[PDB]
Design a protein around this ligand. Structure first.
Ligand SMILES: O=C(Nc1cccnc1)c1ccc2c(c1)ncn2CC1CCN(C(=O)c2ccccc2)CC1
Ligand SMILES: O=C(Nc1cccnc1)c1ccc2c(c1)ncn2CC1CCN(C(=O)c2ccccc2)CC1
Lengths: 471, 469
């Protein structure tokens, strides 16, 4: 069973001996620190953490003894704050005396703004605020996946609008292929849910259960997929029988969309000769609601996409849409699911545009690029103490390393406001109390062991919409 | 509760319909495909077998749950309810699968078979690749353990050169990655993989994982020491940094203590606060209880070099038997910012050029150690190499025209020692010809049971560096 006393960085076990004596309050905040591009971030994922790990009776006598036993050996010394943990157990029935205030989930906020704050609600528990830094800072991950996924959606939207005149199908243009490519089952669920803030296509099944349990949607599920082959279901037929494999698969799934990986031996032969001649009759007969989606999976991503389109354009009837771009017939589409990240996505759609191919023709699958190849440094997600009360006096505190001004932190009690022009500003030093800037956008989401405000996944999606979608 | 029917890539739900009719066997394998990182540490499969694959993993409730989810997810009924029910009824929900693997901790060159998977019941031909997704996640502990060991090689080389021995090597790269990974589960897995090579960690989640799935003779596999963070310094207020330092080193006067010293001005902290104002509290400390000064910002190499030159002028420096400078034993440094395998190399080489012993330094690494890694680094990959259809075995493979690096292996595979004592993977069932001795893979999972396992102590022995051996 999960034990919050064993879910912090080891050194934090020793911090209760290090704060100034007579400290009754430690107040800390999380931001995606600005860096002298990702100019705005989607705030998402805290509600998962609050419910799974922080709420309710999280301290027991057994949990205290187990931590005591572990740390004795881990430090070769008795340093553990048993008294402090016992106090929470006795006084609060093991509920954390902490208050967390946060911007609403799904909100899109520029870098360098307070996103949430944490403080103890009982002076005895001044040490508790930063004990839970480690677990709260892990919100970096769903924030960063959601943000990076949204930035890819912006690129897709721009090019889809340019080449087609609308945004139809945008929410299915970037499919999560990342289940095998992330570091754990838990990560798979968290990351997949973050991508679904922006899109509806996923093969990372773990995301669905997380959303259902912690957030909730009006619809039965937040994400969808379609029948699709992998190399094993093609290659198992034997190298001389690729055509038989293709025929079998498209016939099995004749009335729904079907994606067929086509590069097992020779992607170009498969497109030109197998799909484009031998099996052409089984493709041109398909419904618009049930296209064949051809899937290359190797080679230079841009070069391969363009060559695949060129081949298909010569074997199938291509039209020219009202924007002047080439469009494959509605029973035939392409998905590029190899080597896709935010950079290569941009390269591919720009290359397509230059060759006069509509973005309507293509979708993308992304795995490692979408869910794994991200770190806390990308958006400088960071948690810092900004205010303490010692001997009954409040003190505004901060770091400001001489050799790196980018790592300077904010001072004092913080609040987030709308500016007169409708942008965001973080007020420092308790200046929000002056009330010159309207209401603090941070809301209490956790207090003394209870989750006090929750968001549905539908609300989060609404909050995270693109401007272009809003227009 | 975990449901293995919901723990695969969506598209695999539809694969039972795609294989050739009358297929009775699907046999697949995992390798770190050949293209830096010439050899890999095999680690972490045991965790996966025990936590997710063994015992009764199918129930009526789990089948119904999956059925209901997939119906909405595909907007169609494509889920193999009958196949899963068969496993439930015939095997009491135990997976009819056999997995063979190289021993955990083994160090194996790229492009060798590391584990194989096949169904043991013809009805469950589809099951082999259903569990690809789960098993492929072994890329992560493999890659962490491998990259950690590569850093250990660098540290060993330079420590040996500058000091004449490897004392303390196992404490020279400390895991700071708990906050910088993507989840609690990932933290435990990644921390455990780092502990294959080192003994220093702050990612507490690693300890319980090792204890539960692997085991050590020692009470714990990893250790830490009291250390400050910026909040415990800055909380004292900007004019009271000295007071914070004094309080902390006095509280931890007889154990090692690490104190982050860059809150405002690392160079002032080292030269004036530690080097002058509080010097008397440092030079009095035991060799078993040094002050470890922690810079945490600036160019990592330039900052380490300047911190060392500052301390070298305020404290008595000796010259060790190799001709390198050594701080007194009550004083050390740890660089815990911007450390990955690349910058680690740069820092130790820069220290060597300035005649500073690697004895003086330790490193902390977080995202660089546990997060900034992907399945592409070692090309960790699972592929089908052999099927039986209509009673006939076929050797199968992919070989994409535009990328020969993605060509997969053919047929039944086995791992062997060559006449020169190296590893070789034989394809096409050629291991059966008995020209290369016995298969070095062992059966580790069969029909719902873990059949062979390794303690964490044995994994560590297998993973030792040559220079350690
Ligand atoms: O192979 C697949 N997934 C997978 C998972 C893990 C590892 N590798 C691959 C896979 C999964 C879902 C797929 C897929 C292929 N091909 C299409 N989809 C889902 C959607 C089907 C509906 N879509 C289209 O019709 C469409 C496709 C291209 C352009 C415009 C529209 C857009 C994508
Ligand atoms: O600040 C720390 N950890 C942390 C965790 C998460 C996020 N930020 C920081 C932290 C953790 C462990 C530390 C530390 C500092 N400073 C030293 N250690 C552990 C060990 C203590 C014993 N060691 C030495 O005495 C030693 C140090 C340098 C050279 C030679 C020997 C080697 C390192």
């Amino acid at each position: 069973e999960f034990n919050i006393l064993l879910a912090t960085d080891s050194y934090k076990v020793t911090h209760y001996k290090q704060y100034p004596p007579n400290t009754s309050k430690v107040y800390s905040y999380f931001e995606c620190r600005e860096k002298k591009k990702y100019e705005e971030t989607v705030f998402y994922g805290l509600q998962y953490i609050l419910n799974k790990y922080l709420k309710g009776k999280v301290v027991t006598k057994e949990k205290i003894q187990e931590a005591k036993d572990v740390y004795k050996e881990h430090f070769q010394d008795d340093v553990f704050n048993e008294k402090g943990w016992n106090y929470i157990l006795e006084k609060y029935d093991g509920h954390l005396p902490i208050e967390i205030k946060a911007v609403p989930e799904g909100f899109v906020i520029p870098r360098g703004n307070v996103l949430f704050t944490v403080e103890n609600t009982d002076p005895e528990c001044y040490w508790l605020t930063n004990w839970i830094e480690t677990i709260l800072v892990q919100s970096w991950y769903p924030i960063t996946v959601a943000t990076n996924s949204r930035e890819q959606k912006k690129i897709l939207a721009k090019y889809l609008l340019e080449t087609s005149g609308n945004l139809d199908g945008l929410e299915y243009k970037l499919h999560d292929f990342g289940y095998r490519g992330v570091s754990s089952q838990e990560t798979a669920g968290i990351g997949a849910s973050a991508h679904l803030v922006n899109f509806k296509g996923t093969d990372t099944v773990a995301g669905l259960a997380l959303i259902k349990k912690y957030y909730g949607t009006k619809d039965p599920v937040p994400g969808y997929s379609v029948p699709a082959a992998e190399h094993s279901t093609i290659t198992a037929w034997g190298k001389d029988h690729e055509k038989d494999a293709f025929e079998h698969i498209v016939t099995q799934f004749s009335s729904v969309p079907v994606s067929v990986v086509s590069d097992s031996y020779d992607i170009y032969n498969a497109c030109e000769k197998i799909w484009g001649e031998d099996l052409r009759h089984l493709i041109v007969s398909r419904s618009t609601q049930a296209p064949l989606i051809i899937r290359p999976d190797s080679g230079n991503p841009l070069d391969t996409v363009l060559k695949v389109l060129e081949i298909l354009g010569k074997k199938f009837p291509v039209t020219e849409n009202s924007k002047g771009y080439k469009l494959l017939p509605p029973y035939l589409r392409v998905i590029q699911g190899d080597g896709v990240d935010i950079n290569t996505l941009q390269e591919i759609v720009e290359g397509m545009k230059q060759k006069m191919w509509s973005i309507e023709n293509i979708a993308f699958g992304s795995g490692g690029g979408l869910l794994q190849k991200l770190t806390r440094d990308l958006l400088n997600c960071s948690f810092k103490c900004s205010y303490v009360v010692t001997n009954g006096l409040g003190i505004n505190v901060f770091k400001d390393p001489v050799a790196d001004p980018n790592k300077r932190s904010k001072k004092g009690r913080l609040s987030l406001h709308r500016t007169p022009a409708g942008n965001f500003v973080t007020l420092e030093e308790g200046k929000g109390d002056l009330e010159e800037y309207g209401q603090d956008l941070l809301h209490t989401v956790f207090k003394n062991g209870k989750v006090t405000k929750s968001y549905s996944f539908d609300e989060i999606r609404k909050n995270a919409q693109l401007n272009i979608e809003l227009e």
